[PDB]
Design a protein around this ligand. Structure first.
Ligand SMILES: [NH3+]NC(=O)c1ccc(-c2nn[nH]n2)cc1
Ligand SMILES: [Cl-]
Ligand code: NA
Ligand code: NI
Ligand SMILES: [Zn+2]
Length: 331
């Protein structure tokens, strides 16, 4: 069995290997990459996303979100407070202000230590889920706006057309902006390209061990758990690497830098934080190997989670017994 310890693998495709997206995902899996839940892909030197980032300041962040924590430094939830709209140029200036700028630090480990010590005492602002793309239309390899759609994948695997579309999203981050522990909607894959700026640190639990993380989360957030049997679907809970280690939870960590892709695999729980001002682009995708994960994915039906109408067809077709109750939770 490949990659039996479930390490995060890093790949360096050649320009030729970068042509066929789907083929390379399958190749990574043949090497056991999926066992970790996350892989890093470093593009060949010949490749570029777009020519420059000099002209992005006028993009609008219509609803920046302030991420306010409660709890303890290693075990906390966060809620998103809506702020007034601002441009990417305005948000960059805010990220670099004394209030929000990254502190002086020696290396990525020293910054990580500072993050876990101090995150809860600050409330960073970030831009999330902004439909759009920064890949140039002429970039033919690994352009996140031009991957096979999930709806076409289900049609090719299972036989029936469904409604829905599948387009990328942009994210603008600053120091301490935080992504809570989660798997993707319907346990899909995701891919994330860090276009510009400071790094993003990721934590990931192997898919084979995801129920260990779920168990711990129920223990650590007991009121949440009573409320919803899939509360990690709400994407609000943080548990530090120290606490995971204390509890014996298998996990790994890695830092993504500008110009690198990260792929998350079906049912790979992940969380992390941004080092400073940055811009990333991400989208969910499927392969044939996803279909069984999608059939088995937990669902939140308590109301809290709420998602793109595109998830409706996936539930309806893959999970007909659960559909009516899930649909009640979407209202
Ligand atoms: N599936 N979405 C993610 O894994 C994800 C979600 C949000 C963020 C984020 N970056 N700064 N705050 N949150 C980063 C990644
Ligand atoms: Cl700090
Ligand atoms: Na490890
Ligand atoms: Ni994710
Ligand atoms: Zn719920």
């Amino acid at each position: 069995a490949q990659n039996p310890n479930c390490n995060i693998m890093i790949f360096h495709p050649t320009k030729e290997e970068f042509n066929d997206f789907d083929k390379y995902i399958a190749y990574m899996e043949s090497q056991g990459a999926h066992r970790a839940g996350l892989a890093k892909i470093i593009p060949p030197k010949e490749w570029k996303a777009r020519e420059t980032y000099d002209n992005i300041s006028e993009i609008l962040i219509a609803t920046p979100l302030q991420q306010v924590a409660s709890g303890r430094a290693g075990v906390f939830t966060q809620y998103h407070k809506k702020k007034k709209a601002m441009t990417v140029g305005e948000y960059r200036h805010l990220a670099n202000s004394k209030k929000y700028q990254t502190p002086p630090h020696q290396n990525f480990e020293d910054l990580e230590r500072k993050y876990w010590k101090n995150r809860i005492y600050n409330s960073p602002i970030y831009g999330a889920d902004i439909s759009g793309s920064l890949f140039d239309e002429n970039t033919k390899q690994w352009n996140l706006g031009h991957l096979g759609t999930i709806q076409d994948l289900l049609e090719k695997e299972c036989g029936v057309v469904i409604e829905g579309v599948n387009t990328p999203y942009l994210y603008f981050g600053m120091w301490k902006t935080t992504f809570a522990w989660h798997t993707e909607d319907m346990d899909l894959y995701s891919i994330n390209y860090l276009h510009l700026g400071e790094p993003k640190t990721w934590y990931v639990v192997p898919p084979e061990h995801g129920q260990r993380l779920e168990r711990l989360a129920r223990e650590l957030f007991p009121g949440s758990s009573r409320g919803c049997g899939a509360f990690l679907r709400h994407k609000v809970a943080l548990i530090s690497p120290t606490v995971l280690k204390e509890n014996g939870i298998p996990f790994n960590r890695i830092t993504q830098e500008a110009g690198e892709f990260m792929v998350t695999f079906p049912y790979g729980y992940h969380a992390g934080f941004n080092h400073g001002f940055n811009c990333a682009e991400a989208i969910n995708f499927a392969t044939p190997r996803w279909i069984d994960y999608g059939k088995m994915a937990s669902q939140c039906s308590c109301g809290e989670a709420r998602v793109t109408f595109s998830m409706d067809a996936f539930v309806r077709i893959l999970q007909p017994e659960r559909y009516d109750l899930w649909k009640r939770g979407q209202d």
